[PDB]
C-alpha cells in the first residue's frame, strides 16, 4: 500500500502481516490491546478521568546469559523463539497505585507458533516468574502444538540394502551410510546425528544405521518433555496464582491441554481448540466425517462443554473480558481481595423478590432486573455481576459480583427449565439431534461438576469469598455420585469465608443440603435460611407417603370422600416442619434472614468476617500449636468490653479503627 | 429350633436373626469374620503356623460420659445407637508384631440402620479417632439413609380451622391447638414441640401453629447436618488414612455417598447402593420403570461404573478382600510400606515376553502366565498382583503387587480390544443395548479417569510406590480433556517414588507421553524405556505423511511403480527416530532397559530410592529452608568415597548397614 498517511506497519515487519493473515493479532501488538481495554476500564468507571499514558506500562521479557528473565525494549519481530512474554504494570480503578501481571503468548508467525524445547523452557520460566512474584499469569494461545520433524541431514544421503538391486520392489533389509556418507557428517560435524555399525559385504563397508538422532533440536521426545514440563508447571500455577487463557488463533495438542490446565479460558470466535488434527481424525475414522476444525474445537463446542468459560467476538473483546475478570482478583497472592465501591451503596433494601406464583431468573436476584417502571435492585451491586461458564450446565449460574464493593464468587440455582439441545452425532449417519430437559432446582452430572469447578476456581488464584444461593430439590443422572464428592472436596479446601443462603422461594432437601452443610468446613462456612424458605430430608409429598399413610389419615378423620382435603392437610402438617424457625431451633443455621434486609446483613457480616480472618492470619505467626478457635477467641478478647461480638458493623468498625493498635499487640508476642 | 447341640445364637439375641433376615451379617458377628479372614491369611502364607487366638483381638468402642471413645466388653445388641465401632489389633504376615485399624458399621437391626444425629456424631468420632492414631478406617455399609419423621406428638391432637365446619371439603385456612391441646404438651413437658400464636374467634382462643419442631431428635435438618458432618469427615479421612467401604446389606442416601467419599469400596452381590429410593424414582418418572433396587444400585451397575472397586460373593468374601487389600498398606500413616518377601525372590529374569506378532494380556507381564510347560514368571512376585476396579474402564489395568517383597501400585495398558456392552435404557422403551469398542493402547474418557483415580488412591492412604507400564498410542472421546488434567494433578501430588516404564512392544506417542513425563514431578518420577520400545510426537504413518510427502519421495528415488516399497522405506526412516537410543541421547529418560533384566534393576532401584527418601525425610527436620536437591546432595556426601552413587544395590546396601550411624549424623544437627 503506497502513499499511506503514516508508515505501513505490515511492511516494516512482515510478521505482523503474517499474523493478520492467520486471523489473529500480532503478539507484539497485544500489549496495545491491553492498554485499550485498560483505558476503557476507566471510562466505564469514571468518564471524568484524565488518563496519562504512564498509567499503563509494558516491558517485554527475555532470558539473559544466565537464562534469567529480564526486561528489554526491542523492535517487534526480533524474538529468536516462538514464545514471548510481557510484564504489565497498569493502574486500574481497583488499584489506583497500579497492579502487575504477566502475559505469555505464542508467536504464530514463528514456525507456526509450535512448541519447541526452547519455547517450553521459556513458558516454564515465565510461569514461575509470575508464581514467585505472586502475580497473575495470562496466556495467549495461538499455536500448532508440539514441534515435529526428522533429521533432514540424513534423508538425502541415506542408503538402503535391497534384497537385490536388480529388483528393488522385492524389498529391503536395512538402511546404512557409505564411507563417503559418514564423512559428510564428520565434515558438517553432525556425527552424533546417527548411530551406526560398520558392516562389510561383497563390496566395501556399509555403516548400518541403528538409530537416527538428528542435529536439530525439537524433532520428537524432547518436545514431549518440554510439554510435560509446562503442563505440570501450569497445573501448579493454577493452585498458586490466577491463571487464564485466551485462544486467539487456534490451540493444538499441548496448546489445547494447557487451556484446560489453566482452567479459566476465553475463546475467540473462529479460533478452534484442537487436541488432534481433524484430517488425521478422518483417517482413524476411515471416511471423511469432518470438514473443518471449527466443527471440532469451535466455540459452539468448547463453550458448550464448559472448557471455554467465555467467548469473545474478537481479540480485543477477549482482552477486555480478561481485564474485567481480573478486577475481582487481588493484585497478588495472599493480598486482600480488590475492594471497589460504586454508586450502588450497601445501605438499601433488596427490590426484586421471587414469588411462588411466578417464574423468575435467578440473575434478577443477583444483579437485579430492569422493569418498565424503573430498576429493581438485587442483592449485589448494580452491574457488578460477571457470569462465567454461561454456555455449559445452564442448570446452575456462576459468576463474580460485588457486595457493597466487596468482590465475591456467586453460585445460584436456575429455576427455569434448561433446554440443552445436543447436536447430531457425526460418527454415526443414523443418530441425529437430541433435545435434553434439565429440570430446575434439580442436580445433574454437569451441574455438580460445574459447581465443584466454580468453587475451586473461586478458591484457587482468585481467593474470593463465596455465596451459594442453595436451592436444589434433588438430583438425577453414577456420575452425579462421583462429581458429588468433587464438591465436598472443594469446600474442605476453601480458604475464604463462605456463605450458604437458601433464597426465599427456595428450598433445600435431602443430599442437596448435605453437599453444602456448614459442618463440612466450619472454619469458613456459615449457613442462613430465608424466613420464606423450606428445608428437610424429604419434600412434603415424600414425607406424608411414608409417615402419614391412609390408616393415620382415617384415624385423624373425625368429621363424620373428604380425602382430597384431608390429603392436603397432610402436606401442610409436614411442610410445617421444613420451616426456617425449626432450623434455628435445631441450630443447623446461623440464623434466619429476610430477603429485603439480606444485603445490609450480608454486607456487614462479610466485611466483619474478612476483618477477623485477617486477624486470625496475622495471629498465625505466634504460637505454632494454636487452634483456630483459640485464635479467634484471643482476638475477640481484644475487643472493648462494651462491643457486642454479635454486632458485625460494630466489630468491623472497631477493628478497622485500630489496625495499628492491634498490630502492636501482635508485635508484642 | 429346639434340641440343638449348642445354644441358639439367634434366640439369645433376636437382633442377630433380624440381621440375617435382612440378608446380612449381624454387626457384632463381623469381628469373628475378620478373625477368620485373618486366620486364612496366615494359612495361605505359611501352612505350618500354630496360631493362638491372642493373634487377633477385637475391642468395641463406645463414648464415655465425656463423649470420648473408650474400649468396653458387653453383650451383643446392647448398643443404644444404630452405629457401632471395633478396634482391631491383629498379627499378620506383613506385621508379625501385629497391626491396628478400626471398623465402623451401621446396625441394620437398629431402626433400619438409619443415620440419626447420634449415629453421625459417633461415626465422626470414630473417623477422627482413626485419623488421629493414623490407623486405617474400615466402614461396613448397611443402612437406610438419613433418619426421617414428624412430631408424632402433635398429629393426634392438632386442630384445623375449616372455612365452614358444615362443609369441610370446602377447604381450610390453618392448623392450631386448643387451650386443652396446649395443656397436654405442657404436661408432657413437650412445649417446645411447636410454635403458636394465641388467636380468638367467635369462640374461645385457638393457638395457631406456625411451626412444628417436635420433641424427638432426628426428624429432618438435624439429620442433614449430621450427614454433612460425616461426609466432610470422610472426605478428610481419605486424604489422611486408608479408607475402605464394604456394602453388606444396602447403602442408601448419605450411605451411598459415603461409599464414594471413602473411594475404595467392595460391594457384596445382592446388596444395592441406592442414592434415592426406586419406588420414589418411578414417581418422578411417571410410570413404573424399575422393579427392583438391584437394577439401580446392583453390582452389575456399581461395579461396572467404577464405584465398586471390587465385588464379593458374600460378606466373608468381602472381609477377605479388605484384609488382602490392607496387606499392601502400612500399619499407619507415614510408616514404611509393608515389606513382604515370598518364594519368588528378586534375583531372576523375566520369563514372559510380549511379541509384536502375538496378542497378550498385560497381566501376564505383571504377575506372569501359566503355560502347558511350566509357569512363566512376570515382572512382579508370583501371585502378588491384586487388581482393583476390574469391572470398569477395562482399557487400563490397575492393582497392587510386589517387587521382591516391596509393595507398590501398578497400572498397565490393555492391548486387547475391550468390548464394553452398555445395557439398554429403561427410561426409553425405544433405546436398547449398545456395544462399545474400546481400542487398545487408546485413551478414553473412562480410561483417563480410572488412571487419575488409581494414582490418587495409591498416593492417599495407601502411600505406596508406583509403576505405570506406559503404552498409549493416542486418545479419543471434551471429557478426555477435563479428566486429562486430573492425571497431571494426581502426579504433582504424588509423595512416593514413581516409575514410568514403556514396556517392550509398547510405545508412547503425542500427549500420551506428556501426561506422564518425569518433568511433571521430578522429585518422585523417573522414566525408563525398553530397548524394544518406541516413542515420538507422531507415529511413523503420521510423520511421513507430513515431513515426507511425495516430492521428497520422488527426489530420493534413484532406482531408474516402486511406490509401495519406497513408501515403507519412509516409515522405516521415521521409526528410526522413535528409538530408545534417541531418548537417551536427548536425556528424556533415566536410561534404556531390557525386559528380562528389568525386575532385577527395578527391585534394587526402588529399594535404593526408598532408602534415600527415608533419609531425605529424616533430614527434613533440620534447616527449614533446604531444597530437596540440597538434601539428597548432603545425604549422598555421607556415602563412602568408594561407593558408586549410580550403583543402587551398593547404595541401598551401605545405607541399610548404617541406619544408626547415619542417625547419629542427623542427631548431631
Ligand atoms: C440427606 C440424604 O443424604 C444424602 C443423599 C444423597 C447424597 O448423595 C448425593 N447428594 C448430592 C449430590 C449432588 F452433587 F448432586 F448434589 C450427589 C449425590 Cl450422589 C448424599 C447425602 C438422605 O440420606 O436422605
Ligand atoms: C505432545 C502433544 O501434546 C499434547 C497433545 C494432547 C494433549 O492432551 C491430552 N493428552 C492426553 C490425554 C489423556 F489423558 F487421554 F492421556 C488427554 C488430553 Cl486432552 C496433551 C499434550 C502434541 O502437541 O503433539
Closest CA to B397 of B386, B408, B407, B387: B387
Grid cell, residue B425, equals 435404557
The chain B residue lying nearest A489, using CA atoms, is: B235
Does any ligand 2 atom lie closer than 6 A to the CB of residue B134? no
**CA angle at residue A524 from B489 to A613, to 5 degrees?**
110
Q: Where are the beta strands (DSSP E) in B27-169?
A: 56-63, 69-72, 83-92, 95-106, 137-142, 159-162
Q: Compute the radius of gyration of chain A from its Cα atoms.
A: 31
3-class secondary structure, A149: coil
Q: Based on DSSP, count helices (H) and strands (E) in chain A, helices before strands.
A: 23, 28
Annotated binding-site ranges of B for acetyl-CoA = 146-148, 511
Does any ligand 2 atom lie closer than 6 A to the CB of residue B481? yes
Grid cell, residue A668, equals 508484642
CB contact under 8 A, B510 and A150: no
Measured in angstroms, how far is the CA atom of residue A276 from the centroid of ligand 2? 8
Cα–Cα distance, A100 to A91 (Å, whole number): 9
Cα–Cα distance, A627 to A609 (Å, whole number): 18
Give the pairing of strands B95-106 and B137-142.
parallel
Q: Where are the alpha helices (DSSP H) in A519-562?
A: 540-547, 550-556
| CB distance B156 to A556 below 8 Å | yes
3-class secondary structure, B39: helix
Report which secondary-structure segment, H or E, holds B663. Answer: helix B659-667
Cα–Cα distance, B553 to B185 (Å, whole number): 97
- Stretch(es) of chain B classified as CATH 3.90.226.10: 1-148+218-333, 334-669
Measured in angstroms, how far is the CA atom of residue A141 from the centroid of ligand 2? 16
3-class secondary structure, B259: helix
Q: Which amino acid residue places its CA nearest to atom 9 of ligand 2?
A: B511
Cα–Cα distance, B584 to A174 (Å, whole number): 22
Grid cell, residue B375, equals 509357569
The number of C-alpha atoms within 13 Å of B628 and in the hemisphere containing its C-beta is 9
Cα–Cα distance, A518 to A538 (Å, whole number): 19
Cα–Cα distance, B311 to B270 (Å, whole number): 10
The number of C-alpha atoms within 13 Å of B613 and in the hemisphere containing its C-beta is 20
Name chain A contacts of B157, Cβ cutoff 8 Å.
Answer: none
Nearest to A254 among B260, B514, B581 (CB): B514
Cα–Cα distance, A463 to A455 (Å, whole number): 10
Does any ligand 1 atom lie closer than 6 A to the CB of residue A448? yes
Pick the ligand that lies closest to the CA of residue A256. 2
Q: Where are the beta strands (DSSP E) in A132-241?
A: 137-142, 159-162, 172-177, 194-197, 207-212
Pick the ligand that lies closest to the CA of residue A543. 1
Closest CA to A37 of A344, A314, A451: A314
B437 part of contact set with chain A, CB < 8 Å:
no
Name chain B contacts of A284, Cβ cutoff 8 Å.
Answer: 474, 476
| CB distance A235 to A137 below 8 Å | no
Does any ligand 2 atom lie closer than 6 A to the CB of residue A257? yes
| CB distance A338 to A328 below 8 Å | yes
Q: Which amino acid residue places its CA nearest to atom 14 of ligand 1?
A: A484
Cα–Cα distance, B296 to B275 (Å, whole number): 9
The chain B residue lying nearest A238, using CA atoms, is: B489
| Declared resolution, Å | 2.8
Shortest Cα distance from A562 to chain B (angstroms)? 6
- B434-467 in b/e form (b: 16+ CB < 10 A) is eeeebbbbbbbbbbbbbbbbbbbbbbbbbbbbbb
The number of C-alpha atoms within 13 Å of A6 and in the hemisphere containing its C-beta is 2
3-class secondary structure, B487: helix
Cα–Cα distance, B504 to B354 (Å, whole number): 7
Grid cell, residue B310, equals 471390587
Residue given cell 525398553 in the structure block = B530
Let me know how long chain B is. 669
Report which secondary-structure segment, H or E, holds B1. Answer: none
Residue A642 burial class via C-beta count within 10 angstroms: exposed 0-12, middle 13-18, buried 19 and up = exposed
Residue B617's contacts (CB-CB under 8 Å, 6 or more residues apart) are none
Cα–Cα distance, A560 to B59 (Å, whole number): 59
Grid cell, residue A315, equals 481479540
Nearest to A254 among B280, B511, B548 (CB): B511
CB contact under 8 A, B149 and A547: yes
Measured in angstroms, how far is the CA atom of residue B538 from the centroid of ligand 2? 12
CB contact under 8 A, A150 and B552: no
B290 part of contact set with chain A, CB < 8 Å:
no
Estimate to the nearest angstrom the gap between the alpha carbon of A497 and the chain centroid: 20
Region label for B298, one of left (φ > 0), alpha (ψ between -120 and 50) or beta (otherwise):
beta
A146 part of contact set with chain B, CB < 8 Å:
yes
Q: DSSP letter string over A272-310?
A: -EESS-HHHHHHSSSS---S-THHHHSHHHHHHHTS-SE
Grid cell, residue B137, equals 478406617
Residue B233 CB neighbours (<10 A): 23
Closest CA to B90 of B403, B319, B382, B400: B319
Does any ligand 2 atom lie closer than 6 A to the CB of residue A297? no
- Stretch(es) of chain B classified as CATH 2.40.460.10: 152-217
Measured in angstroms, how far is the CA atom of residue B470 from the centroid of ligand 2? 14
Q: Based on DSSP, count helices (H) and strands (E) in chain B, helices before strands.
A: 23, 28
A572 part of contact set with chain B, CB < 8 Å:
yes
Residue B547 CB neighbours (<10 A): 18
SS (H, E, C) B543-572: HHHHHCCHHHHHHHCCCCCCHHHHHHHHHH
Residue B259 CB neighbours (<10 A): 26
Q: Where are the alpha helices (DSSP H) in A22-93?
A: 30-43
CA dihedral B653, B655, B661, B666 (to 10 degrees): 180
Closest CA to A129 of A210, A70, A172, A192: A70
Residue given cell 446388596 in the structure block = B271
Q: Which amino acid residue places its CA nearest to atom 16 of ligand 2?
A: B512
Q: Is the dihedral of CA A436, A437, A441, A443 positive or negative?
A: negative
Nearest to A224 among B224, B261, B514 (CB): B514
Q: Where are the alpha helices (DSSP H) in A204-274?
A: 221-240, 254-261
Cα–Cα distance, B422 to B407 (Å, whole number): 35
Closest CA to B109 of B69, B146, B144: B144
Grid cell, residue B433, equals 443395548
Q: Is the dihedral of CA A372, A377, A381, A387 positive or negative?
A: negative
Backbone angles phi, psi at B88, to 5 degrees: -110, 130
The number of C-alpha atoms within 13 Å of B428 and in the hemisphere containing its C-beta is 7
| CB distance A254 to A231 below 8 Å | yes
Report which secondary-structure segment, H or E, holds B493. Answer: helix B479-493
The arrangement of secondary structure in A152-217, i.e. its CATH architecture, is Beta Barrel (2.40)
A280 part of contact set with chain B, CB < 8 Å:
yes
| CB distance B573 to A155 below 8 Å | yes
3-class secondary structure, B42: helix
Q: Hey, which of B477, B510, B546, B588 would you mutate to test ligand 2's pocket, going by the most ligand atoms within 8 Å of its Cβ?
A: B510
Closest CA to A25 of A276, A270, A243: A270
| CB distance A666 to A638 below 8 Å | no
Does any ligand 1 atom lie closer than 6 A to the CB of residue B144? no
CB contact under 8 A, B232 and A158: no
Does any ligand 1 atom lie closer than 6 A to the CB of residue A510? yes
Cα–Cα distance, A97 to A107 (Å, whole number): 32
**CA angle at residue A72 from A69 to A76, to 5 degrees?**
115
A228 part of contact set with chain B, CB < 8 Å:
yes
Measured in angstroms, how far is the CA atom of residue B515 from the centroid of ligand 2? 7
Closest CA to A325 of A389, A231, A251, A414: A389
Does any ligand 2 atom lie closer than 6 A to the CB of residue A119? no
CB contact under 8 A, A225 and B586: yes
Name chain B contacts of A476, Cβ cutoff 8 Å.
Answer: 284
- B418-429 in b/e form (b: 16+ CB < 10 A) is bebeeeeeeeee
| CB distance B225 to A588 below 8 Å | yes
Closest CA to A176 of B572, B531, B562, B544: B572
Grid cell, residue B104, equals 465402623
Q: Is the dihedral of CA B517, B523, B524, B528 positive or negative?
A: positive
Give the pairing of strands B83-92 and B56-63.
antiparallel
Cα–Cα distance, A630 to A632 (Å, whole number): 6
Report which secondary-structure segment, H or E, holds A572. Answer: helix A563-575
User: What are residue B177's DSSP bridge partners?
Assistant: B207
Cα–Cα distance, B631 to B641 (Å, whole number): 18
CATH of domain B334-669: 3.90.226.10
Nearest to B221 among A225, A511, A588 (CB): A588
The chain A residue lying nearest B149, using CA atoms, is: A547
| CB distance A407 to A337 below 8 Å | yes
Ligand 2 atom closest to residue B447's alpha carbon, by position in its atom list:
15
The chain A residue lying nearest B491, using CA atoms, is: A232
Q: How far apart are the first and last CA of chain A?
A: 72
Measured in angstroms, how far is the CA atom of residue B443 from the centroid of ligand 2? 10
3-class secondary structure, B119: helix
Nearest to A586 among B221, B261, B579 (CB): B221
DSSP A345: -
3-class secondary structure, B659: helix
Cα–Cα distance, B416 to B23 (Å, whole number): 38
Cα–Cα distance, A544 to A571 (Å, whole number): 6
Closest CA to A229 of A140, A122, A86: A122
Cα–Cα distance, B612 to B607 (Å, whole number): 9
| CB distance A141 to A248 below 8 Å | yes
Breaks in chain A (C–N beyond 2.5 Å) sit after 477, 560
Grid cell, residue A21, equals 493473515
Report which secondary-structure segment, H or E, holds A360. Answer: none
The chain A residue lying nearest B563, using CA atoms, is: A169
Give the pairing of strands B507-509 and A418-422.
unpaired
B543 part of contact set with chain A, CB < 8 Å:
yes
Name chain A contacts of B430, Cβ cutoff 8 Å.
Answer: none
Q: Where are the alpha helices (DSSP H) in B374-478?
A: 445-459
Does any ligand 1 atom lie closer than 6 A to the CB of residue A126? no
Measured in angstroms, how far is the CA atom of residue B138 from the centroid of ligand 1? 21
Q: Hey, which of A442, A515, A519, A535 would you mutate to test ligand 1's pocket, going by the most ligand atoms within 8 Å of its Cβ?
A: A515
| CB distance A129 to A70 below 8 Å | no
Estimate to the nearest angstrom the gap between the alpha carbon of B125 and the chain centroid: 22
Q: Crossing angle, helix A659-667 and helix A648-657, to 10 degrees?
A: 70
| CB distance B403 to B598 below 8 Å | no
Estimate to the nearest angstrom the gap between the alpha carbon of B351 and the chain centroid: 31
CA dihedral A36, A42, A47, A52 (to 10 degrees): -70
Cα–Cα distance, A453 to A388 (Å, whole number): 11
| CB distance A371 to A497 below 8 Å | no
Cα–Cα distance, B437 to B441 (Å, whole number): 13
Specify the experimental method: X-ray
Does any ligand 2 atom lie closer than 6 A to the CB of residue B490? no
Q: Hey, which of B396, B511, B512, B543 would you mutate to test ligand 2's pocket, going by the most ligand atoms within 8 Å of its Cβ?
A: B511
**CA angle at residue B341 from B337 to B343, to 5 degrees?**
155
Measured in angstroms, how far is the CA atom of residue A507 from the centroid of ligand 1? 15
DSSP B358: B
Residue B22 CB neighbours (<10 A): 18
**With respect to CATH, is domain A1-148+218-333 assigned 3.40.50.620?**
no
Amino acid at each position: 500500500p503506497i502513499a499511506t498517511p503514516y508508515p505501513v506497519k505490515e511492511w516494516l515487519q512482515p510478521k505482523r502481516y503474517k499474523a493478520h493473515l492467520m486471523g489473529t493479532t500480532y503478539v507484539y501488538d497485544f500489549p496495545e490491546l491491553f492498554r485499550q481495554a485498560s483505558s476503557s476500564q476507566w471510562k466505564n468507571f469514571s468518564a471524568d478521568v484524565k488518563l496519562t499514558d504512564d498509567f499503563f506500562i509494558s516491558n517485554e521479557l527475555i532470558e539473559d546469559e544466565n537464562g534469567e528473565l529480564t526486561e528489554v525494549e526491542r523492535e517487534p519481530g526480533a524474538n529468536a523463539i516462538g514464545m514471548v512474554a510481557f510484564k504489565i504494570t497498569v493502574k486500574t480503578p481497583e488499584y489506583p497505585r497500579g497492579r502487575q501481571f504477566v502475559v505469555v503468548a505464542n508467536d504464530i508467525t514463528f514456525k507456526i507458533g509450535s512448541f519447541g524445547p526452547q519455547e517450553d523452557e521459556f513458558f516454564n520460566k515465565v510461569t514461575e516468574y509470575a508464581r514467585k512474584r505472586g502475580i497473575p499469569r495470562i496466556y495467549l494461545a495461538a499455536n500448532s502444538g508440539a514441534r515435529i520433524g526428522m533429521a533432514e541431514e540424513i534423508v538425502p544421503l541415506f542408503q538402503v540394502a535391497w534384497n537385490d538391486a536388480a529388483n528393488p520392489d522385492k524389498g529391503f533389509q536395512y538402511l546404512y551410510l557409505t564411507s563417503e556418507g559418514m564423512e559428510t557428517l564428520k565434515k558438517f560435524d553432525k556425527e552424533n546425528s546417527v548411530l551406526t555399525e560398520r558392516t562389510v559385504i561383497n563390496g566395501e563397508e556399509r555403516f548400518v544405521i541403528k538409530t537416527i538422532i538428528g542435529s536439530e533440536d525439537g524433532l520428537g521426545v524432547e518436545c514431549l518433555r518440554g510439554s510435560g514440563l509446562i503442563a505440570g508447571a501450569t497445573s501448579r500455577a493454577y493452585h498458586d496464582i490466577f491463571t487464564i487463557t485466551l485462544v486467539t488463533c487456534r490451540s493444538v495438542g499441548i496448546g489445547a491441554y494447557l487451556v484446560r490446565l489453566g482452567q479459566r479460558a476465553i475463546q475467540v470466535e473462529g479460533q478452534p481448540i484442537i487436541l488432534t488434527g481433524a484430517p488425521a481424525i478422518n483417517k482413524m475414522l476411515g471416511r471423511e466425517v469432518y470438514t473443518s476444525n471449527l466443527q471440532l474445537g469451535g466455540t459452539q463446542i468448547m463453550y458448550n462443554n464448559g472448557v471455554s468459560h467465555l467467548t469473545a467476538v474478537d481479540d480485543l473483546a477477549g482482552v477486555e473480558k480478561i481485564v474485567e475478570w481480573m478486577s475481582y482478583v487481588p493484585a497478588k497472592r495472599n493480598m486482600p481481595v480488590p475492594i471497589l465501591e460504586t454508586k450502588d451503596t450497601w445501605d438499601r433494601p433488596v427490590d426484586f423478590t421471587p414469588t411462588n406464583d411466578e417464574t423468575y431468573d435467578v440473575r434478577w436476584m443477583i444483579e437485579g432486573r430492569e422493569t418498565e417502571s424503573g430498576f429493581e435492585y438485587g442483592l449485589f451491586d448494580k452491574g457488578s455481576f460477571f457470569e462465567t461458564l454461561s454456555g455449559w450446565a445452564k442448570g446452575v449460574v456462576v459468576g463474580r459480583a460485588r457486595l457493597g464493593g466487596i468482590p465475591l464468587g456467586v453460585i445460584g440455582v436456575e429455576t427455569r427449565t434448561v433446554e440443552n439441545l445436543i447436536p447430531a452425532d457425526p460418527a454415526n449417519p443414523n443418530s441425529a439431534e437430541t433435545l435434553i430437559q434439565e429440570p430446575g432446582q434439580v442436580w445433574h452430572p454437569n451441574s455438580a461438576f460445574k459447581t465443584a469447578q466454580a468453587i475451586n476456581d473461586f478458591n484457587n488464584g482468585e481467593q474470593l469469598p463465596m455465596m451459594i444461593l442453595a436451592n436444589w430439590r434433588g438430583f438425577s443422572g453414577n456420575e452425579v455420585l462421583k462429581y458429588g464428592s468433587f464438591i465436598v472436596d472443594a469446600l474442605v479446601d476453601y480458604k475464604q469465608p463462605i456463605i450458604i443462603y437458601i433464597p426465599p422461594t427456595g428450598e433445600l432437601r435431602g443430599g442437596s443440603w448435605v453437599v453444602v452443610d456448614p459442618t463440612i468446613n466450619a472454619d469458613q462456612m456459615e449457613m442462613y435460611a430465608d424466613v420464606n424458605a423450606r428445608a428437610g430430608v424429604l419434600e412434603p409429598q415424600g414425607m406424608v407417603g411414608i409417615k402419614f399413610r391412609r390408616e393415620k389419615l382415617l384415624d385423624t378423620m373425625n368429621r363424620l370422600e373428604l380425602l382430597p382435603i384431608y390429603g392436603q392437610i397432610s402436606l401442610q402438617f409436614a411442610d410445617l416442619h421444613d420451616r426456617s424457625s425449626r432450623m434455628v431451633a435445631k441450630g443447623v443455621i446461623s440464623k434466619e434472614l429476610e430477603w429485603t434486609e439480606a444485603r445490609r446483613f450480608f454486607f456487614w457480616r462479610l466485611r466483619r468476617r474478612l476483618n477477623e480472618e485477617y486477624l486470625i492470619k496475622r495471629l498465625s505467626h505466634q504460637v505454632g500449636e494454636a487452634s483456630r478457635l483459640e485464635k479467634i477467641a484471643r482476638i475477640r478478647s481484644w475487643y472493648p468490653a462494651s462491643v457486642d461480638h454479635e454486632d458485625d458493623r460494630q466489630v468491623a468498625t472497631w477493628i478497622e479503627e485500630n489496625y495499628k493498635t492491634l498490630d502492636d499487640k501482635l508485635k508484642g508476642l
